[PDB]
From a paper:
As a model biocatalyst class, we selected carbamoylases, which promote the hydrolytic cleavage of N‐carbamoyl‐amino acids. Together with hydantoinases, they make up a scalable and widely‐employed enzymatic cascade for the production of enantiopure (un)natural amino acids (=hydantoin process). Based on its reportedly moderate activity for N‐carbamoylated‐ l ‐tyrosine, we produced and purified SmLcar, a carbamoylase from Sinorhizobium meliloti strain CECT 4114. Using this artificial link between enzyme activity and bacterial proliferation, we evolved the carbamoylase SmLcar to accept carbamoylated m‐substituted tyrosine analogs.
When challenged with the synthetic ncAA precursor N‐carbamoyl‐ l ‐3nY (cam‐3nY, 2 mM), SmLcar (10 μM) yielded 6.1 % of the ncAA after 24 hours at pH 6. Conversely, N‐carbamoyl‐ l ‐3iY (cam‐3iY) proved a more challenging substrate, with SmLcar failing to yield detectable levels of 3iY at pH 6 and only providing 0.8 % of the ncAA at pH 8 under otherwise identical conditions. As expected, the parent enzyme displayed a low turnover frequency (k cat=1.05×10−4±1.01×10−5 s−1) and catalytic proficiency (k cat/K M=3.54±0.98×10−2 M−1 s−1). To rationalize the massive performance improvements of our engineered carbamoylases, we obtained crystal structures for SmLcar and the double mutant SmLcar_GC. Guided by the electron densities of unknown small molecules bound to the active sites of SmLcar and SmLcar_GC, we performed docking studies (YASARA) with the synthetic precursor, cam‐3iY, for both enzymes. Comparing the resulting structures of the wild‐type and the evolved variant revealed a striking difference in the orientation of the substrate in their respective binding pockets.
Author numbering:
A (entry chain B): 7 to 416
B (entry chain A): 5 to 416
Write the structure that this text describes.
């Protein structure tokens, strides 16, 4: 029956958006920047004012706990991320974290007690923008990455994740992944166009498509772009161009349910009149179909070296991100659907297109996701947009799904 | 003639000493224009020149002019010029050989007690390379009236630092009006940066021409979007447009052989996140030909096809020329002088069309100009493994020396 405070939630989103603003009304609040520090501090202060106690793990993940009435009951987590892309929207990650805070504030308002404690979770470096892989803290949590692997990830300026975590003062004391969860929920914008296009308020997320991030390092020969005869050039840029085209072909020949593309690129030494000695870029390929994902990976890894060999270019590939398609916990999926039905919101099943911390939580606990629409499916763009009504409806569903799972006690 | 030759060892030592300033990671140099290492190199060069009796002037572009007087106080100077600034992956010999061969010619004239009618001016042009700040040949460009001082000063590097502020910072903002000097003649000695002299077993390149260039900077506008969740049919992929442009440039280059090059050395994605399609992709296409019609045909074709590639993908396309000169013909009288010097000295020689751009290309606009080349191993340049021998260096310096003496005129 009872709804969260839509205005309080919205105001919190607008306040958090002031921290680490981008250039176009979104956010550039990347993981382990001073702006990330400030956002974490603001979130902490709100949660502490709402009666939550804070724990922080050695990956900087923040766990804000509301007690249950059963002191041995495992917690129901509500998680997402406050770190953003360089061209981040105000809603990616933030909606889920702040909807957790609002769920708690509404429980406080209504004097609600639950059997299971509730833990609002802010995972470090979900985005994998500054340091790859994405979902890095939740990955250490679920036992997929070592702490030392995570700490040694570097940004483009050669700064290491571990040192930056230490720099901004968010190194916590808890062993990563020492917490066991009764259940994990994550509310997130769709980052796709389906809910909007289908006129559905709520995405009942059943699955998440898998990914490989394959980082290519191509070795060319630095040479003068003026005086070097064409047939003596070892052109790693041209090899990269052919690889990008080949990735487009691979993605298109695996439709529907496949994507492939490149967002990050570096030439060295990156002089206008020097052919690059090194060209580094990451191919992002995804599919909800396991066999398709692995076929795309195998094909790209077989074809790309041949492209390079034809040009005399060296080719090295490193996986800097990976998870197989995820199936969310079917019982919690039904809980989400039942919450939508109880509240009178339209819903449909979705397969998440993006990766989320929920994907790793799913390895160690019953996990599901809830989505609201976003305009044009636009995300990782500062123009990312949802309405107050969209935000609120999904937060209501989160609230009720959590209450059903954590169990209201009079 | 017979017997007046430069000191090969002194020249070589000077190259090896200068190579210690702003070393790269593989035995070459990363001594880019208007870095502190450039400052140190300039100061070392200055001190050597001053020890050889040369007097220094510096212009507002930081170009250094080191004068050996002549016997006629109204005679205009014969310049010997090149550049001490390097690429990030620079060789020890590109630019440096020409400047230090100037110093060596002067030291040899001093050793032999030679007097000339015309003064000799060893010239170190600022920012020939156009690595850090584009265009290349920036100071010689201002000198020859191609660029305004304010255009040059406003050039920015990838860190957003401006050329004018950096020039001032390292202390090389001089007082002379740029281009106030008139030259009787200009010579530039440079490594070939191509494989021909070595392959043809020739000691000296009698440079007759320099191939022309366009540097076309593309700015492609895509739409930032999530690389996971965005359907393929909704993507506005500026990276893919760039890939197709690079491929089209390769096709253009290959269909225009022989005597054409096209390629890309510089690229930027924004925001350059692994899971964000780029909102902006910026890169520079370098196309060259010795043939004017071919050069302009390649430019017109690239500028016509690239917007079509982009339009097919919904990508915006903007093109700016950030460097250009038409093929250069060097002064025939000075070419003959160079050839005659090689013949007098008994060096094997052949004619060359320079593949690279040089400060000489702008000097040619305002004075009788030519170039001399020596071989380099495998034609490799803009790579730290750039290599010449002591003997190659010295032979070309001898030719420079004799060409300069003929032009400046020995006075007993
Ligand atoms: N909001 C983030 C979406 C998940 C993402 N880091 C990814 O590349 O899948
Ligand atoms: N330094 C020798 C090469 C000249 C160069 N600025 C070019 O791109 O042509
Ligand atoms: Zn997210
Ligand atoms: Zn995101
Ligand atoms: Zn040069
Ligand atoms: Zn050069």
């Amino acid at each position: 029956n009872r709804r969260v405070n839509a205005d309080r939630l919205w105001d919190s989103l607008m306040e958090m958006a002031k921290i680490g603003p981008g250039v176009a009304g979104g956010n550039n609040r990347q993981t382990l920047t001073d702006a990330d520090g400030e956002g974490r501090r603001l979130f902490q202060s709100w949660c502490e004012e709402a009666g939550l106690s804070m724990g922080v793990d050695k990956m900087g993940t923040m766990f804000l706990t509301r007690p249950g009435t059963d002191p041995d009951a495992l917690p129901v987590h509500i998680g997402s991320h406050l770190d953003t892309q360089p061209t981040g929207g105000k809603f990616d990650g933030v909606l889920g974290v702040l909807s957790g805070l609002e769920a708690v504030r509404t429980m406080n308002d209504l004097g609600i007690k639950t059997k299971h404690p509730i833990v609002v979770t802010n995972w470090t470096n979900e985005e994998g923008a500054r340091f790859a892989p994405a979902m890095l803290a939740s990955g250490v949590f679920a036992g997929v990455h070592t702490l030392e692997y995570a700490y040694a990830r570097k940004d483009p300026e050669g700064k290491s994740f571990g040192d930056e975590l230490k720099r901004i003062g968010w190194l916590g004391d808890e062993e990563v992944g020492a917490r066991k969860m009764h259940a994990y929920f994550e509310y997130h914008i769709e980052q796709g166009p389906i809910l909007e296009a289908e006129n559905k308020q709520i995405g009942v997320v059943t699955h998440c498509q898998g990914l490989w991030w394959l980082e290519f390092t191509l070795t060319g020969r630095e040479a003068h772009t003026g005086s070097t005869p064409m047939d003596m050039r070892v052109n790693a840029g041209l090899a990269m161009a052919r690889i990008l085209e080949m990735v487009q072909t691979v993605a298109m020949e695996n439709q529907p349910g496949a994507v492939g593309g490149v967002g990050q690129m570096f030439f060295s030494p990156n002089s206008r009149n020097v052919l690059p000695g090194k060209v580094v870029f990451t191919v992002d390929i995804r599919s909800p179909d396991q066999a398709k994902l692995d076929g795309m990976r195998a094909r790209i890894e077989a074809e790309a070296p041949k492209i390079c060999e034809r040009l005399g270019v060296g080719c090295s590939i490193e996986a800097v991100g990976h998870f197989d398609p995820v199936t969310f916990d079917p019982k919690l999926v039904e809980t989400v659907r039942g919450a939508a039905e109880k509240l009178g919101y339209s819903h449909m099943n979705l397969v998440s297109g993006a990766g989320h911390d929920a994907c790793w939580a799913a390895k160690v606990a019953p996990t599901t996701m809830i989505m609201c629409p976003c305009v044009g499916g636009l995300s990782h763009n500062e123009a990312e947009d949802i309405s107050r009504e969209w935000a609120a409806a999904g937060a209501d569903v989160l609230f009720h799904a959590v209450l059903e799972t954590a169990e209201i006690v009079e």
